[model samples]
Target chain A: NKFKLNYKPEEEYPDLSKHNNHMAKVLTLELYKKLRDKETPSGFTVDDVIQTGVDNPGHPFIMTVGCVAGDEESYEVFKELFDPIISDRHGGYKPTDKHKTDLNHENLKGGDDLDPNYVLSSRVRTGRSIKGYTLPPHCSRGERRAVEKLSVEALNSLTGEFKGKYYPLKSMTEKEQQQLIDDHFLFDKPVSPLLLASGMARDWPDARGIWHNDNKSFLVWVNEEDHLRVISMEKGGNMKEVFRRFCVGLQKIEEIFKKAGHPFMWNQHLGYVLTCPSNLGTGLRGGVHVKLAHLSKHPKFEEILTRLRLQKRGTSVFDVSNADRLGSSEVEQVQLVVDGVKLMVEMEKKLEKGQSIDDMIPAQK
Target chain B: NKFKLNYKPEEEYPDLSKHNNHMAKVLTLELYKKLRDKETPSGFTVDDVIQTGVDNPGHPFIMTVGCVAGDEESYEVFKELFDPIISDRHGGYKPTDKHKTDLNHENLKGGDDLDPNYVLSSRVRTGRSIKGYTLPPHCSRGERRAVEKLSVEALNSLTGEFKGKYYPLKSMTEKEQQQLIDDHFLFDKPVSPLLLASGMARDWPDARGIWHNDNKSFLVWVNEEDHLRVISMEKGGNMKEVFRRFCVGLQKIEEIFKKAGHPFMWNQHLGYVLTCPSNLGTGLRGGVHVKLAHLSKHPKFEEILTRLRLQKRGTSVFDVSNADRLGSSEVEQVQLVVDGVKLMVEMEKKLEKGQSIDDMIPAQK
Candidate 1:
């Protein structure tokens, strides 16, 4: 009965072509019709979709899905809104397989190791949400603070290499907070209109802090986009070491929750339960900041990056990161980027020595 | 025959009376008379002594010894100039004990661990100079750059947790460098006029940079007062972890130098050779920033800190740190301060809960 159709998805949003599957288009049409019905518990505006589409012009499906499920009233219909889209995106969305939780640090493969001269730094990070609490948009300030408090307790309990401190946003001076953010040691305010619209930024700088070890190679962001964002980073191209530390650190934190009789929210089909549909699977992004100035100038630069599934960001021409977070396991995706950067670095070295690009080719002998 | 004793040490410099040992008095007198003589390669003015003495009034012996040895011309006679005084301060100024290098993280002794509430942050740092090069005064710009380059190489070669990116002072924008300095993540301009007069600050911002892990926990200051100043720091009271990382990190860099057929300057009796005699022993300074707001209000606060060998800095009434870096092994000195802070924290806690100071005293039951 609550299905008054209004705008046509194909005409209203032409950017659905970017997605890998037809589920996004189908859901976009359904959302457009459901919002038009007066009895819908939570409704979305055409402007919201348009703005989100404009902000993330590269991925409109992600924008639309993230915004639609951002509303708390939409919870009952949220799975219906996203399950089909996820199934299409992931080639069959299924509940998280407890047996599939692999945190092996040594089995990582691809290249032997990244070269420091070519690779500036390496990082591996993942998003996690605590059980029993709704995602940021619908969660109350008290609930958010409770999550932060629990993390602080666990963070304080850390010993040996995993030990560190947590500095809550409220406890720091404005300059101190700004300094951390400037150094990329702390997270920034929500920039996405979708997250802002969903009330994710309700209590700005209220229940957020950073936890890191003495070396600061292992760090955790508390009460950010997710309840926790554990990260491990270091200089040079040692993906094995970085990923190993990340896996160990994540498991140690999870053990803390387990010992306390709590576990992170997980769904079999969806994998990690997160606010953004884009981060629904492994929710891991492993990347490297590399130096490929010469290779980046080639005509096929963009094409090569697309072929390798890599994306470039930052003001530096050489800055590149993995483009896809799905379609592969965390270690495999990290290995893909590591191998790709190694190839880029090799090319750049050849160019630096004034060699022709054709030398990179294996000719028929 | 170029001797001209213009001022008597007893009459011209009365600050020597403050030292606990007669050796400091005798050395101050010897330095005062020797510098007034023309035979002394580098000369010092009474104003120099006054400025350093006035600046560090609580530790004039440290100021005088640091300044006298800061001049490269004085190096030939440096040990003769301060050995007796060092013996008086440290009880016995001994040579480097190569067999005693302990990088193994365990074996650290102290309380179970430090409390985060009273202990804000902990830092362990040390200075080192290369064997072949002279310190700042006699070292040319080329020599300084070469040292910095070698240090950069050693730093870049670092792997695993100690690996980090380097930001040269010359390469950074003013705002960028200022941000790191303001956050206390990087070293600032030397405020010591003694260092300025000794040519340590001659090149201003040249041949200097900071290397820090992504989290800014482990940092190295290149081409600062010495050739290298490796540091390990973290939020709250975790001396064992901080020091362990520091010792291990320091050894790794030293290994790189050793593998490259280079070794840091060392003296059997003087330990790791440095420009300042005050930092001669162990060459390690382990410290903590602690909160003692209530204890600060007590009339005997300064006296108590002096008795405990601690010092207070910054504008915060709650702030305090270890006052001395000599006379004890690195671990022993760190433990001394840790125990002192624990006692202070206990007193503060008792006061906060409306208990009198007498309750802190052990009763003869």
Candidate 2:
């Protein structure tokens, strides 16, 4: 077997107290039983779960552990190995508010309103899981294949500009696969230890694919971190349009599921539950990649990002994304970042003109 | 009144002996009553119809006059103006076969199979008119605006990658408008005399618009020649993918109209009816732009194009498209051109190695 099955999670993630509950989902089996069914894609087996006990420094197991949780036996075997990660992701699991589920496109309007000079591109994405299937950890090979088929069929049913085809990872040529990732048209990365320990990688490349439009602006990641990762993105920060397309797409997919009698996995309390707790709440994450210039070099840059609930990226170009998808409505979550990015742009402009940083940052009080 | 209404069609187009019955739709008002509702968009008046009696010789009116047949007064007045265009579009309309409409994408397999070197870009487009409205020629201002609104709404409803936005001509800035046309994202051409005589331009830019994805690959021309002109295009000759997306968009639009309880103007014999006789039959036109250096110079090049049912484009980088949409199945039409392009490419290669023309042309059997 390619996996190291003797691994344990407890030994790997000792400082799980720093993260949030969403992150904890990847570290522990606490939410494993929440999945309605258990199965894994082809090529994935229990050994992959045991091997996952080893860790990746920055990238953590997002779906692998969730898959391992599908098997009650594997759940017990990997619980200790997963506990630390779960703790790390959710920062010791303090009680949080119920997940937000309302998705009203009308209220979401910042995408088209963004300043074009500093913003390069904007994107909005959500993680979705189908009901009646166990999380990947405990899923069967058949279930994994079923997810791929259903997702592809639903995606193909989309009409107009949204129509696209699914390119299965197994069937893609090496060149085609590389080009997709290079173009950012497909997602490909190494699995985290937590995932291997939980059995999410059991089937390797089976039942995994991608769907995208002719423009490659809208895309879907099927059988990846969740049943589906619906995404809308475009160049030059047209967030409103991006979000609008996403919402429209989500509505259609949901409708297709309802018609097929296979609804998505939605929790009354969690809204849209996922393999990762960080993706809880409205499950929407919206943001733009912008050039920050001088502001990025300030001593308070990291603190500013934390205070504004935003994520940072490269030296000057930072990705300002909503840190939490819960707490606020989807539109509000996106709007917060929209406003924050505007402030940063303003600050950058002032700094370029020799303005002091003091006026930009508010007093601690 | 902003319009110059003292016009008449009889003095403009004097010839009526040529052309087919389909072309007669523009001049005879045979299809006007078909529009169930008679309304116009805001800021428009009936004088625009009378003003259309003037002619723009080079560009021909296709959908506008064809749709104006709902009223006899307008028909009798404009018949003279429309007759010549009918003759012009077709060399001369002889008795034609019943317009073929069967559309089976399964038989269309050459797009993905084209040689990558010579083919630069491939595109396919079709025109569609919704039921319950006269063609634009006699359509009221309210109908124009309604068509725009309904078309936008339906396009917006598309899920997956096919989703996009309709950018109204009136809402766009001069630069924005020019750029879209420059990029081949919008249709920018003068109206034909037939359309002028039919009053299709009454409302001016009030209801005209274009819809396209982020990459401008999937596009829809709204309130132009037809109620809707769905298109799919991309760089490099991947005709399969291009045609596939077009069919998907067409299917979605058709479904949207069906859901709204408004079917398209299709005939049992003519298939998808249009204001122009040139676009009868399957209504599908698949083509590619390629660099044909040597073959274009041969004396028999025009003859070759005729034999293959292909139309050649400008200079060295020629655009090869199916000559007619009626004589063969859509796929067969596309295939003929695809095979013809391959032969041209092969000939180009031979010429580079010093091959002569005498052996290339088959002994005229």
> Which runs of model 1 end up more than 4 angstroms from their true locations?
A1-24, A28-77, A87-101, A191-194, A356-365, B1-365
Candidate 1: C-alpha RMSD after superposition? 30.2
lDDT of 1: 0.61
lDDT score of residue A332 within candidate 1: 65
The TM-scores, chain A only, for the candidates as listed are 0.77, 0.75
Model 2 chain A lDDT-worst window of ten = A1-10
For model 2, how does the per-residue alpha-carbon lDDT over B107-163 read when each residue is reduced to its tens digit?
A: 765544666677888898888888776565545444656677788888888878886
Model 1, range A1-365, lDDT digits (tens) per residue?
00113324333332343443233355465565454332223233332322233223235333344333332233335445455556555545543323133467666764578678778888887988877555565454446676887888987888988878787765676486766666567676564533443335544566788888878788798878888888898878787789888888887888898787767766444556666666765788778888777787778777677667776777533556665544456666666677777777777888898886632221100
